[PDB]
Design a protein around this ligand. Structure first.
Ligand SMILES: CC(C)CCC[C@@H](C)[C@H]1CC[C@H]2[C@@H]3CC=C4C[C@@H](O)CC[C@]4(C)[C@H]3CC[C@]12C
Ligand SMILES: CCNC(=O)[C@H]1C[C@@](F)(c2ccc(CN3CCCC3)c(F)c2)C1
Lengths: 301, 106
């Protein structure tokens, strides 16, 4: 595979900008947690979790792959192939499973608002939910990557390249694809729909002067939380859906109807999401607009 | 993509040969492999759109295919005497010659 000198020079330039953008963007997000201790909230920690994954896609996953698309050869031994594979499959399903968790936390904040108020500053509870997520994420692809070769009596991946030993196993790929896509997509759809109905109901609720007046202010806040969640959920959906959907389709036509370069394009769209998130946090959240101010332009006092 | 399609052909015919039982199937599969190999040898790999035919990379690409054609011809020799088992065993060696020498350039 690979590319002529002229094409590698244009792609390397572009691959590099994406690296710098992803790395700087998520370092800046992590440094804002340092600057502002008001970001010590469960919701905020769930976003910090997304920024860590994103940092690693930039610092680790894109960089090791660059030389491999450009030249067609993995030059790092199968050992480092397995580690890079584990980490790329891990950061994918972790981002997905963390969007689920963020969506749940937002659903509880609108639908269970008074119970959520007491729990919100509990970051120990938050950090333990994110850890469980890292283990659940690992479990889906982690062991299969590390163990398939010995279960199958040796590798079917020539020493040239770097693929999951299950990557032309359609049976494994259909059940991993459908879980990887539907678990997150149906859970996330449900929470967001359920936030919409909750707000619509309370909006059509008939209350007296102070209760009504207290709850249109609380609905203004819920409506904002719902936009915030829709925007990030949508932009993730549109970065992640092509790759998740194409895998389901590759596995169900046994690799005969999906060209390699379709799914390889989709990698960059999914990895590009890691550059985008850093910009969405302050677009969509006060708490992040506040933190970035405390860090970059604290002159606002 | 004619190089992509000639590689396609090498794959399909190599699995027929694992799967076969008589000399005619093995023979036809190799004659196909051979044609595809000679065709693929005349290709310019995408990697190399910008290189001379006297380029070390382009000489090496073409030498990979000399190994391959020659190995297919040894296996034709054996198939063309009804030695189906030898000719099938020799087909395995094609996989080595493909990965070690040619797959780099795809
Ligand atoms: C402007 C910057 C920040 C964005 C970077 C975009 C670059 C890194 C992305 C956008 C389009 C991507 C290309 C789209 C499609 C393919 C085909 C695939 O078979 C190999 C990778 C390749 C060639 C991608 C390489 C990386 C790529 C060029
Ligand atoms: C074309 C050069 N080789 C490749 O692109 C290989 C295809 C490869 F096995 C691969 C790596 C990682 C994944 C999983 N990634 C999860 C996030 C985007 C894709 C694959 F599905 C496939 C790397």
């Amino acid at each position: 595979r690979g590319f002529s000198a002229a094409w590698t020079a244009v792609l390397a330039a572009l691959m590099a900008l994406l690296i710098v953008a992803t790395v700087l963007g998520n370092a800046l997000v992590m440094l804002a947690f340092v600057a502002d201790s008001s970001l010590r909230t469960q919701n905020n920690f769930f976003l910090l979790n997304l920024a860590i994954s994103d940092f690693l896609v930039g610092a680790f996953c894109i960089p090791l792959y660059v030389p491999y698309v450009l030249t067609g050869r993995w030059t790092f031994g199968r050992g480092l192939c397995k580690l890079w594979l584990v980490v790329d499959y891990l950061l994918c399903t972790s981002k997905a499973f963390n969007i689920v968790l963020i969506s749940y936390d937002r659903f509880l904040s609108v639908t269970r608002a008074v119970s959520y108020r007491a729990q919100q500053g509990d970051t120990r509870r938050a950090v333990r939910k994110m850890l469980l997520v890292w283990v659940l994420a690992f479990l889906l692809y982690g062991p299969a990557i590390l163990s398939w070769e010995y279960l199958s009596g040796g590798s079917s991946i020539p020493e040239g390249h770097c693929y999951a030993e299950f990557f032309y196993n359609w049976y494994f790929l259909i059940t991993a694809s459908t879980l990887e896509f539907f678990t997150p997509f149906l859970s996330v759809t449900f929470f967001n729909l359920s936030i919409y109905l909750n707000i619509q109901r309370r909006t059509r609720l008939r209350l007296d002067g102070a209760r009504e007046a207290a709850g249109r202010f609380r609905l203004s806040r819920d409506r904002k939380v719902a936009k915030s969640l829709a925007v990030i959920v949508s932009i993730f959906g549109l970065c992640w859906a092509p790759y998740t959907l194409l895998m389901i389709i590759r596995a169900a036509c046994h690799g005969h109807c999906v060209p390699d370069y379709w799914y390889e394009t989709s990698f960059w769209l999914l990895w590009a999401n890691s550059a985008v998130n850093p910009v969405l946090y302050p677009l969509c959240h006060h708490s992040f607009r506040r933190a970035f101010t405390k860090l970059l332009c604290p002159q606002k006092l | 993509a004619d190089l992509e399609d000639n590689w396609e052909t090498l794959n399909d015919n190599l699995k027929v040969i694992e799967k076969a039982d008589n000399a005619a199937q093995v023979k036809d599969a190799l004659t196909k492999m051979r044609a595809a190999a000679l065709d693929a040898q005349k290709a310019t790999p995408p990697k190399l759109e910008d290189k001379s035919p006297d380029s070390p990379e382009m000489k090496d690409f073409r030498h990979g295919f000399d190994i391959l054609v020659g190995q297919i011809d040894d296996a034709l020799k054996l198939a063309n005497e009804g030695k189906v088992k030898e000719a099938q065993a020799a087909a395995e060696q094609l996989k080595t010659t493909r990965n070690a020498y040619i797959q780099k350039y795809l």
